[PDB]
């Protein structure tokens, strides 16, 4: 009820909410600080660079180069005959790769070198090509995607179907919706991004951002694509660079050639967006001159990239903006009474010069540090871009101005960049997050396994070089690997504090022993060689089990499936990392107890999944909503902390009521294995007692009828298939069988009660002794007494008691009546004389 297990549980709950106290970054950065320090300088950041083309591999990079795919030879062939349109890019929501070519669409997928799916129909140039989510009311539901294309006539939508091919990718099938068109004016349109609903908003070489509604109305007197701008900002020079949307608050952020942002909330219409004002970067720089950071140094950089910061990411901050000086500018969009915003925070890159692949002697300058645009601009060279990646530094929470460092210097021209893990958050309003509230949305460490690692496909001038935005466990385990020999063991603690350390150790060791035995060995050595090791156990199994305790059963399903996955992966790939499947003293003993806890947690997952799977298979009361009777939405109950160790007797009752229905037939032994591999705890209820039986008779009566057919079936179920029924005290059982007119149910149950309970007939001298029994069977006798009294099924029950196997079926009501037969015969006559 209340032992060290549940107590360390609430303890790790407290640590969870403590880890949660980042708040959100609006607090980690205390952006309420109106001043310049919310800006993250260079005193706070190292820039480790190792240069392109040498065997050195960075062991603390937030990203890691993985694979490179060329461009379609056919694509190159046309692109040579392409004459005006050049925008390479990747579409994360399909993982497809594209290059905006002169006019048409012959579009490929990079992972396999997918065919550049050909369409030679267009006669007017695509300034750009976009990927949009299929908006309801337009398409056949199997339409997974659509294609939006520019023409000197207009913009157009091209439906698509992305089902997986012979995940690698979902293969695309052409869909034709050619009526999408309207020629009006000479605006250029290239800024093609879209939200969850699938809004098409287009600006281009000129700043005119029209929200195209793509509509199932194939044009009749005006073609099917119409351009609708929120241009309530007349902006003579607006080579608008890009656009950016805040789905978590229905807000849009644009970067003009000057980065200029106009306010945009999704207007009251529900399909358009309402703009009222315009903010240029001049606002930000005036605020910067006022913000007490060196501003004449800040001046002047033109804004060349932006990156939304949704409210899940930061309470009030809107977006990260990146200039030609690469300066990471973080702005807010909100209504004073997103109309009014305030400038506080700007992340500066580190100060380690990007000059040498070779380590130049590292540097620390905690005084206000700053370095040249040479190291501030990623694409320092006009031909060879230097890919720069970062997420936030969790463990540096007290060092919140720190960020995760890396260096991806390459040789091609980067043109498009986004996450493919942005896809797992594409349909939803949030970007990469780790919570449903702004707090704990950043900590990759907490969700680094329940969702696949952050990966990246970075389009290059000759293809795309694929990256994986590295996890705490990724860079960690590889620093584990890196130890061979800053100090890795020392630096881990510097980031992992022997609690996050040991958690990733145990979590990492158990997880990698299936695929990388020696990474498990590294982590195990790390943790083993109020404790922080026990705190690592707490953290690990809490990130495991709060998916029942505090997160939505969604992470529950994620973790259970990935448990089965690591299990079977270790199994079938048993050829690489073997062993799990069947002074140094104190170190190994911490190690021993910890790995035993690991394997116990594994078998508990497997044991839990089967029982959990069995419980799921039974689905008792889950559908209750479908069956009504004042019960609804059982799925939420599963979400609530009740599945693992907090509901036990009601759980037993639920799985008895599931068993009574027995939707599965020829599935008893499956149940038996669970019973003999899950009822192993002896001093407990191997099967719940009373509402189990009452619940079983509900389903037993409803699922099947003994009287119409299969009556011995329900009796023998009651015995074996519904063994959870028999053992009952004075309870619901009475009414629960009262509905039955016959007495084959209650009588059968009391007979089984006599089998499992009454060893040999001392019930005789219950009274036949005299002056020392009735109790705990008076319930059944009592139930029989009222049913028959109100009855006089019953007429066919006269052959039972008369031919009862046990005399208990021959004594109770006869005594009952006669106070108001050589079994009661002595009681009477000897009681007489």
**How many C-beta atoms surround the C-beta of residue 97 within 10 A?**
27
Asked whether the beta carbons of 295 and 285 are under 8 A apart, the reply is yes
Nearest to 293 by CA among 243, 347, 253: 347
Distance CA 230, CA 275 (A): 6
Asked whether the beta carbons of 75 and 101 are under 8 A apart, the reply is yes
Distance CA 187, CA 227 (A): 11
335: its two tokens: 């209504």
411: its two tokens: 């040789």
**How many C-beta atoms surround the C-beta of residue 336 within 10 A?**
8
107: phi > 0 → left, psi -120 to 50 → alpha, else beta; which?
Answer: beta
Asked whether the beta carbons of 488 and 529 are under 8 A apart, the reply is no
Distance CA 469, CA 585 (A): 39
Alpha-carbon Rg of the chain, whole angstroms? 35
Asked whether the beta carbons of 741 and 800 are under 8 A apart, the reply is no
762: its two tokens: 């001392």
Asked whether the beta carbons of 159 and 147 are under 8 A apart, the reply is yes
Distance CA 456, CA 658 (A): 46
Give the residue carrying structure tokens 């160790």: 645
Q: How many CA atoms lie within 13 A of 800 on its CB side?
A: 16
Determination technique for this entry: cryo-EM
Asked whether the beta carbons of 387 and 408 are under 8 A apart, the reply is yes
In sequence order, which residues have a C-beta less than 8 Å from that of residue 805 and are 6 or more positions away?
751
Distance CA 16, CA 541 (A): 11
Q: What is the DSSP string of 786-805?
A: HHHHHH---STTHHHHHT-S
Give the residue carrying structure tokens 């010069």: 353
Maximum CA pair distance of the chain?
Answer: 123
Give the residue carrying structure tokens 């889950």: 622
**How many C-beta atoms surround the C-beta of residue 433 within 10 A?**
22
16: its two tokens: 């969870």
Asked whether the beta carbons of 380 and 354 are under 8 A apart, the reply is yes
For the chain, helix (H) and strand (E) counts, in that order, are 28, 27
The alpha carbon of residue 574 and the mean position of all alpha carbons in its chain are separated, in whole angstroms, by 28
383: its two tokens: 């031909």
Give SS3 for 346: strand
770: phi > 0 → left, psi -120 to 50 → alpha, else beta; which?
Answer: left
**Would strands 456-460 and 463-469 be described as parallel, antiparallel, or unpaired?**
antiparallel
Nearest to 387 by CA among 461, 313, 277: 461
Distance CA 136, CA 270 (A): 14
Verify cis geometry, omega within 30 degrees of 0, for the bond prior to 441: no
Asked whether the beta carbons of 369 and 43 are under 8 A apart, the reply is yes
Give SS3 for 440: coil
Nearest to 516 by CA among 474, 555, 470: 474
DSSP structural state of residue 229:
B
372: phi > 0 → left, psi -120 to 50 → alpha, else beta; which?
Answer: beta
In sequence order, which residues have a C-beta less than 8 Å from that of residue 603 and are 6 or more positions away?
none
**How many C-beta atoms surround the C-beta of residue 64 within 10 A?**
23
Distance CA 73, CA 160 (A): 23
Across-strand partners of 201?
193, 211
Asked whether the beta carbons of 368 and 362 are under 8 A apart, the reply is no
142: phi > 0 → left, psi -120 to 50 → alpha, else beta; which?
Answer: alpha
Distance CA 53, CA 640 (A): 52
- With 0-12 CB in 10 A as exposed, 13-18 as middle and 19+ as buried, what is 411? middle
Q: How many CA atoms lie within 13 A of 601 on its CB side?
A: 21
Asked whether the beta carbons of 445 and 394 are under 8 A apart, the reply is yes
368: its two tokens: 């206000």
Asked whether the beta carbons of 625 and 634 are under 8 A apart, the reply is yes
In sequence order, which residues have a C-beta less than 8 Å from that of residue 258 and are 6 or more positions away?
237, 280, 281, 282, 302, 303
Positive or negative torsion for Cα 372, 378, 381, 386: positive
Question: CA distances (Å), 467 to each of 219, 242, 369, 417, in order?
Answer: 43, 23, 30, 11
Distance CA 719, CA 809 (A): 18
Distance CA 487, CA 56 (A): 17
Q: How many CA atoms lie within 13 A of 344 on its CB side?
A: 20
In sequence order, which residues have a C-beta less than 8 Å from that of residue 282 and are 6 or more positions away?
258
Distance CA 212, CA 207 (A): 15
Q: Resolution, rounded to a tenth of an Å?
A: 5.4
Asked whether the beta carbons of 289 and 295 are under 8 A apart, the reply is yes
Nearest to 650 by CA among 695, 617, 610: 695
Verify cis geometry, omega within 30 degrees of 0, for the bond prior to 300: yes
Nearest to 528 by CA among 597, 463, 464: 597
Asked whether the beta carbons of 22 and 397 are under 8 A apart, the reply is yes
Distance CA 297, CA 280 (A): 19
493: its two tokens: 């603690």
Helix axes 584-618, 553-572, angle to 10 degrees: 110
Q: What is the DSSP string of 621-662?
A: TTTHHHH-TT---HHHHHHSTTTTTT--HHHHHHHHHHHHH-
**How many C-beta atoms surround the C-beta of residue 583 within 10 A?**
6
Question: CA distances (Å), 46 to each of 61, 405, 414, 476, 566, in order?
Answer: 11, 7, 24, 17, 36
Distance CA 666, CA 339 (A): 66
Q: Please provide residue 122's backbone torsions phi and psi, each rounded to the nearest 5 degrees.
A: -65, 135
Q: What is the DSSP string of 166-197?
A: ----EEEEE---TT-----------EEE--SS
Distance CA 12, CA 536 (A): 9
Nearest to 659 by CA among 624, 627, 626, 687: 687
106: phi > 0 → left, psi -120 to 50 → alpha, else beta; which?
Answer: beta
Distance CA 642, CA 612 (A): 11
Rounded to the nearest 5 percent, the helix, strand and coil shares of the chain are 35, 15, 50
């Amino acid at each position: 009820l209340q032992e060290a297990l549940e107590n360390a549980g609430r303890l790790i709950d407290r640590q969870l909410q403590e880890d949660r106290m980042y708040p959100d970054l609006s607090e980690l950065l205390m952006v309420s600080a109106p001043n310049n320090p919310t800006v993250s300088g260079m005193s706070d950041m190292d820039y480790p660079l190792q240069g392109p083309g040498l065997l050195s591999v960075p062991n603390l990079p937030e990203i890691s180069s993985i694979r490179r795919v060329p461009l379609p030879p056919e694509l190159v062939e046309q692109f040579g005959h392409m004459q005006c349109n050049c925008m390479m890019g990747v579409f994360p929501p399909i993982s497809r790769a594209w290059l905006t070519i002169d006019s048409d669409i012959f579009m490929w997928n990079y992972e396999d070198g997918g065919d550049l799916a050909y369409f030679d129909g267009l006669s007017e140039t695509i300034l750009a090509v976009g990927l949009v989510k299929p908006k309801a009311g337009i398409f056949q539901p199997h339409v997974r995607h659509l294609l939006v294309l520019a023409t000197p006539v207009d913009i157009v939508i091209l439906g698509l179907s992305y089902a997986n091919l012979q995940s690698l990718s979902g293969g695309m099938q052409l869909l034709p919706d050619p009526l999408y068109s309207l020629p009006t004016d000479n605006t250029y349109l290239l800024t093609i991004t879209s939200t969850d609903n699938g809004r098409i908003f287009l600006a281009g070489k000129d700043g005119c951002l029209y929200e195209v509604a793509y509509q199932a109305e194939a044009g009749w007197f005006s073609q099917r694509c119409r351009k609708i701008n929120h241009s309530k900002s007349f902006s003579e020079d607006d080579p608008i660079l890009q656009i950016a949307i805040d789905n978590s608050r229905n807000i849009l952020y644009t970067r003009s050639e000057k980065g200029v942002i106009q306010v945009y909330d999704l207007g009251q219409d529900g399909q358009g967006m309402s703009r009222v004002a315009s903010v240029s970067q001049n606002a930000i720089v005036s605020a910067a001159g006022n913000i007490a950071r060196t501003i004449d140094r800040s001046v002047f950089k033109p804004i060349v990239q932006i990156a939304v910061i949704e409210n899940s990411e930061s309470l009030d901050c809107q977006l990260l903006a990146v200039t030609h000086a690469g300066v990471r500018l973080y702005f807010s969009t909100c209504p004073f009474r997103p109309n009014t915003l305030t400038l506080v925070h700007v992340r500066l890159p580190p100060g380690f010069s990007a000059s040498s692949t070779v380590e130049k002697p590292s540097k620390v300058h905690r005084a206000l540090y700053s370095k040249g645009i040479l190291l501030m601009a990623a694409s320092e060279n006009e031909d060879n871009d230097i890919l720069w990646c970062v997420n936030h530094d969790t463990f540096p929470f007290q060092k919140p101005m720190m960020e995760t460092q890396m260096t991806a210097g390459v040789d091609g021209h980067s043109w498009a960049l986004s996450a493919i893990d942005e896809l797992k958050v594409d349909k939803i309003i949030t970007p990469l997050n780790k919570d449903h509230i702004p707090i704990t949305d950043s900590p990759v460490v907490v969700q680094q396994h329940m969702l696949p690692p952050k990966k990246f496909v970075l389009l290059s001038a000759q293809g795309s070089l694929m990256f994986h935005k590295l996890r705490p466990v990724d860079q960690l385990r590889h620093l584990l690997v890196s130890n061979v020999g800053g100090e890795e063991i020392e630096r881990f603690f510097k980031l992992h504090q022997e609690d996050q350390a040991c958690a990733t150790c145990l979590i990492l060791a158990c997880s990698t022993a299936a695929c990388d035995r020696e990474v498990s060995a590294w982590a195990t050595r790390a943790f083993f060689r109020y404790s922080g090791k026990h705190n690592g156990i707490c953290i690990y199994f809490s990130r495991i089990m709060g998916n029942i305790w505090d997160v939505p059963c969604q992470l529950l399903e994620s973790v259970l499936q990935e448990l089965k996955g690591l299990q079977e992966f270790l199994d079938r790939n048993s050829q690489f990392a073997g062993g799990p499947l069947g002074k140094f003293h104190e170190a190994q003993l911490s190690e021993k107890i910890s790995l035993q806890a690991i394997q116990q947690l594994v078998r508990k997952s497997y044991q839990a999944l089967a029982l959990w799977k069995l419980l799921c298979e039974h689905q008792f009361t889950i559908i209750v909503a479908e069956l009504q009777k004042e019960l609804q939405e059982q799925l939420k109950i599963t979400t609530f902390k009740d599945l693992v160790i907090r509901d036990k007797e009601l759980t037993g009752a639920l799985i008895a009521s599931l068993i009574n229905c027995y939707i599965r037939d020829n599935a008893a032994v499956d149940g038996i294995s669970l019973h003999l591999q899950d009822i192993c705890p002896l001093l407990y209820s191997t099967d719940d007692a009373i509402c189990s039986k009452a619940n079983e008779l509900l389903q037993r009566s409803r699922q099947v009828q003994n009287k119409t057919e299969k009556e011995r079936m329900l009796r023998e179920s009651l015995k074996e298939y519904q063994k959870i029924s028999n053992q009952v005290d004075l309870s619901n059982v009475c009414a629960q069988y009262r509905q039955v007119r016959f007495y084959e149910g209650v009588v059968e149950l009391s007979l089984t009660a006599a089998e499992k309970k009454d060893p040999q007939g001392l019930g005789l001298h219950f009274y036949k002794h005299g002056e020392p029994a009735f109790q705990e069977r008076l319930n059944s006798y009592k139930c029989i007494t009222d049913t028959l009294q109100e009855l006089v099924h019953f007429e066919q029950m006269l052959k039972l008691s008369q031919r009862s196997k046990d005399e208990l079926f021959s004594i109770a009501l006869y005594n009952w009546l006669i106070q108001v037969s050589p079994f009661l015969e002595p009681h009477l006559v000897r009681m007489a004389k």
